[PDB]
């Protein structure tokens, strides 16, 4: 409603780096909000794409940011008869970035990992990795919960049970308010998907540099399944955290599985122990229900609601049989044990192939009227296909079915304007929460500021 | 007054054989539609599916490791396909294409270094390096070329169960000059697989976020060039390209994914699903049954309909089956001529004093081009 599309602050990154692919806000110890931007295609030390993270301080002019330095050297260690080796080439560092209090969690989902013991090996595969950083203190850590030393033939014997070799941990990530780093790993358990949770303090304390295969004590992983509805579900493609069981002493995980049950798609609510509290099923095959999940209180009743993006949802038209426009499903949480049933509102795209629902950003109370608001991105929407971000204001009965504001892409076509979104935080400190939009195809980040 | 004047009305043909490009399966072929503001005028279209119409059967075969038995059953397909398709058409062209999946981690086995030239290294056998889609045989009427080309095909091996089959469908659809799709012919794309399929946004597990643009990327090497740099297509883009190229996709899928591909074919017009055996041994009768089943249904589709214009159809199927609201007629056979009473309504009087849209059956180049003039 009041996001200003004229005075735009553009942060830019290296060309081809996919700057803006993932972005969060970082509040310094002094409270000065910076923008964490992930660029999974930043060139490393040997001109190889290794990814990077840029800590962009808030300046109303934008421009280039200083990179946040991580170790990008492929490590190799002999621990016993096994050679442990990590591969940072095309690891995608910055494909998801989340910032806790003073920690920046930068995840490299496609970081590969192999274990050589003899003529046998552990099948170099994208186990993923998250790089933790305290930028004000300079302290660095790492968290790869899916690294193992089990060899390939052992997995072939077990019929590939508990196979975390293709996790891609940090594909999606979220830090709970208590400080637990929840990682989505949609390739975990042979592409069934898993969640990896460990406290950030326990990741920083358990991390020894040089040691490649260690175990966080407080680390908790999801469970494997033989139910064929979970096969290739990509559980953990998107993760969120909310309050969906009344007990405000526990944190509920909101996991999107966009190909769950033969590409139908699901979003499961769970507790800290990965027991499925509720499961929301996709409305349409191959619509990618669960591609993005947002947890906001859009109707001001204190109970967190669930917004699920289905960016490949096909609606009914005349000149097009089924028009892939995308859809966002709003699930208002009612006063009850679970009570989460049918979507209380359906936001659908209008541009064909616009991918409406790829990102859903809780904007907080954008216009400060008592109801939290929502930004949904169509990274290829708008009448030109360059990308839109649509601001949906909350009301007493959910959201507004019509966007109060559309933010058209200030970048050329292919920029994927809106692929990453981030709101609810006030960069310029004028009392109104702002929106940070990431166009990784333009390698830029647009900063929309909310007017009074 | 608002009228519907018929400009081109060639009578429907009786046989699709002989001199083609004169075979008219839709009548009329052009209509001038004058509509005063906020008015409605009705016109009629006849859609006959003629007999002995030429067929293009591009066999798009999953060549993952589970399909090494199927290559023994396809080895004489093409001669048997020519013998069985000889009663259904007088001009048959068959082609062959193969897919496995995007040759990139975590779909492709990336270690040991010997598992890149031989993904079957851990199976202790030898297959081809993983490919995403390779065009093998351009649609040709020399049906022994199909046998010659499938006898020299080998499978590859990937890691996960979903395949890159929709990537291959997109490439076999949009590379129409490379595949060999004739204009005046039925375009049967026989998509055989025994596994789930990858869809858009699945390529992000490999680092591939760039959406499928639907362009041709099969070069002179006959391989899909954008397999590792471009995402999988969605059902929307793949359906749009199948509709633009008039291609009747046939899911020849094993019983473990028959329900998945039926739920897909419900979302893709012009598609049928046949149950493939675990060794593709019933694929000839599957193709024949799916050609008879695709031609057992006339479904209309509207292309580039103006926003101010709406359409309503009254499908005049089998003699007394006037079915309102339907732009389809199931339960047909080759030779049945169905009718559709279409009614175009305006919503106001737009700025453009003359627009144009086309009404065609799904899977045919024949169309009714309605030139709509707003006076």
């Amino acid at each position, epitope marked *: 409603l009041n996001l200003d599309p004229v005075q735009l602050t553009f942060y830019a990154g290296p060309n081809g780096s996919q700057f803006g692919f993932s972005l969060d806000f970082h509040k310094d110890s002094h409270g000065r909000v910076a923008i964490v931007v992930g660029a999974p295609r930043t060139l490393g030390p040997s001109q190889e794409e290794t990814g990077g993270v840029f800590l962009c301080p808030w300046r109303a002019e934008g421009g280039q940011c200083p990179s946040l330095l991580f170790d990008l050297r492929d490590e190799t260690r002999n621990v016993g008869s096994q050679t442990l080796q990590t591969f940072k080439a095309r690891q995608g560092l910055g494909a998801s970035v989340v910032s806790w209090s003073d920690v920046i969690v930068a995840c490299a989902p496609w970081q590969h990992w192999n274990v050589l013991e003899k*003529t*046998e090996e552990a099948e170099k595969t994208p186990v993923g990795s998250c790089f933790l950083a305290q930028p004000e203190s300079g302290r660095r850590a790492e968290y790869s919960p899916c690294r193992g030393n089990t060899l390939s*033939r052992i997995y*072939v*014997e077990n*019929d590939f049970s508990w196979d975390k070799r293709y996790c891609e941990a940090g594909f999606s990530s979220v830090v709970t308010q208590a400080g637990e780093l929840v990682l989505g790993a949609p390739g975990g358990y042979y592409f069934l998907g898993l969640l990896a949770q460990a406290p950030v303090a326990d990741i920083f304390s358990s991390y020894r540099p040089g040691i490649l295969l260690w175990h966080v004590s407080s680390q908790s992983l999801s469970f494997d399944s033989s139910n064929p509805e979970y096969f290739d579900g990509y559980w953990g493609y998107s993760v969120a955290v909310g309050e969906f069981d009344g007990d405000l002493n526990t944190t509920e995980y909101v996991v999107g599985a966009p190909t769950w049950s033969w590409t139908l798609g699901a979003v499961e609510i769970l507790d800290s122990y990965y027991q499925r509290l509720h499961r929301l099923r996709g409305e349409q095959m191959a619509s990618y229900f669960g591609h993005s999940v947002a947890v906001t209180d859009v109707n001001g009743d204190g109970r967190h609601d669930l917004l699920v993006g289905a960016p490949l949802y096909m609606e009914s038209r005349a000149d097009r049989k089924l028009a892939e426009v995308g859809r966002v499903y709003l699930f208002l949480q009612p006063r009850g044990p679970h009570a989460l049933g049918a979507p209380s509102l359906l936001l659908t795209g209008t541009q064909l192939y616009g991918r409406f629902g790829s990102a859903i950003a809780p904007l907080g109370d954008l216009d400060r009227d008592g109801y939290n608001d929502i930004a949904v991105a169509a990274p290829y929407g708008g009448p030109s296909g360059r990308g839109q971000v649509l601001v949906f204001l909350g009301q007493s009965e959910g959201l507004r079915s019509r966007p109060s504001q559309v933010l058209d892409s200030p970048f050329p076509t292919g920029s994927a304007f809106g692929f990453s979104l981030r709101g609810a935080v006030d960069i310029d400190d004028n009392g109104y929460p702002d929106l940070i939009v990431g166009a990784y195809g333009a390698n830029q980040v647009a900063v929309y500021r909310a007017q009074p | 007054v608002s009228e519907a004047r018929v400009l081109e009305d060639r009578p429907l043909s009786d046989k699709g054989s002989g001199d083609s490009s004169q075979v008219t399966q839709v009548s009329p072929q052009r209509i001038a539609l004058r509509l005063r503001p906020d008015d409605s005028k009705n016109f009629s279209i006849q859609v006959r599916q003629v007999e002995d119409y030429p067929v293009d059967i591009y066999y798009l075969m999953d060549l993952s490791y*589970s399909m*090494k*038995d199927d*290559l*023994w*059953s396809i080895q004489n397909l093409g001669t048997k396909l020519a013998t069985q398709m000889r009663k259904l058409t007088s001009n048959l062209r068959i082609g062959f294409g193969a897919f496995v999946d995007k040759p990139v981690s975590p779909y492709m086995y990336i270690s040991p270094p*010997e598992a890149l030239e*031989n993904p*079957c*290294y*851990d*199976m*202790k*056998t*030898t297959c081809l390096p993983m490919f995403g889609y390779k065009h093998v045989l351009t649609l040709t009427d020399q049906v022994t070329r199909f046998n010659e080309e499938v006898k020299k095909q*080998s499978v590859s091996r990937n890691r996960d169960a979903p395949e890159g089959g929709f990537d291959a469908i997109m490439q076999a659809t949009v590379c129409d000059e490379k595949i060999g799709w004739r204009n005046d012919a039925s375009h049967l794309l026989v998509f055989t697989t025994d596994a789930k399929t990858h869809i858009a946004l699945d390529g992000r597990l490999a680092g591939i976020v760039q959406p499928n643009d639907g362009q041709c990327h099969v070069g002179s090497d006959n391989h899909y060039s954008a397999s590792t740099t471009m995402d999988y297509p969605s059902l929307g883009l793949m359906t749009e390209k199948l509709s633009q190229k008039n291609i009747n996709l046939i899911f020849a899928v094993t019983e473990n994914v028959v329900n998945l591909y039926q739920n897909y074919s419900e979302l893709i017009p012009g598609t049928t699903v046949g149950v493939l055996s*675990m*060794d593709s*041994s019933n694929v000839l009768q599957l193709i024949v049954d799916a050609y008879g089943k695709i031609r057992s249904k006339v479904e209309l589709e509207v292309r580039d309909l103006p926003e101010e214009l709406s359409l309503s159809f009254n499908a005049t199927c089998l003699n007394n089956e006037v079915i309102p609201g339907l732009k389809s007629c199931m339960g047909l056979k080759i030779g049945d001529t169905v009718s559709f009473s279409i009614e175009a309504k305006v919503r106001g009087c737009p700025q453009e004093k003359e627009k144009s849209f086309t009404i065609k059956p799904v899977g045919f180049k024949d169309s009714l081009i309605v030139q709509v003039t707003f006076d």
Partner: antibody
Amino acid sequence: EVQLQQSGTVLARPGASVKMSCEASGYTFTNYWMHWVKQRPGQGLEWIGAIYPGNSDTSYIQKFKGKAKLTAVTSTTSVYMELSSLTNEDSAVYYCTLYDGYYVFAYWGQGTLVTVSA
Amino acid sequence: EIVLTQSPVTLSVTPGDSVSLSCRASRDISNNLHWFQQTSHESPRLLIKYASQSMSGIPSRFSGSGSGTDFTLSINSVETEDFGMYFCQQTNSWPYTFGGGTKLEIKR
């Protein structure tokens, strides 16, 4: 035409070692894995392992790890199997077998009989 | 490994009668089940590949059937050349295993 030609019958003694060959002709030698199968007289067939003549990489059946050892000599296109610490349970017919383009083991050696009587 | 259990262990059939040899896998090996014949005049001879595909040059009396975990080898009219040992073999997972074997006797 893939033909597998093994060595002849070889008498041995317990605790000793026996090396049997398999001359592979009719296909590109280093490309394909060579598989070895054991069949005790009157009993069933038991897979021993495979050898990749390209990089001389070998993978055995856990029952045969340490007992059987596979080596390849790509100059003469021969695969050698060496049984170590022979017992009377090693007196069997050992076949080298190969798969075809359809990945079924249609090509077998005539078999090398081993006798560990002492 | 995938255990292939053949039944019966031995089987007496009159020359000209019909036989049905069974194989049962520990797990799903879809059609990756092959049938070998060994009457000791040569190495094991592959009769039916992929559980239903007769090899070239194999008599038309040998028939394969089955999928998943239960497979069958049927002989229409056993000749004097068919009496021997029949092994089912899986090439689904490595290590590749054989069945216990099934002898065919003449049953006079």
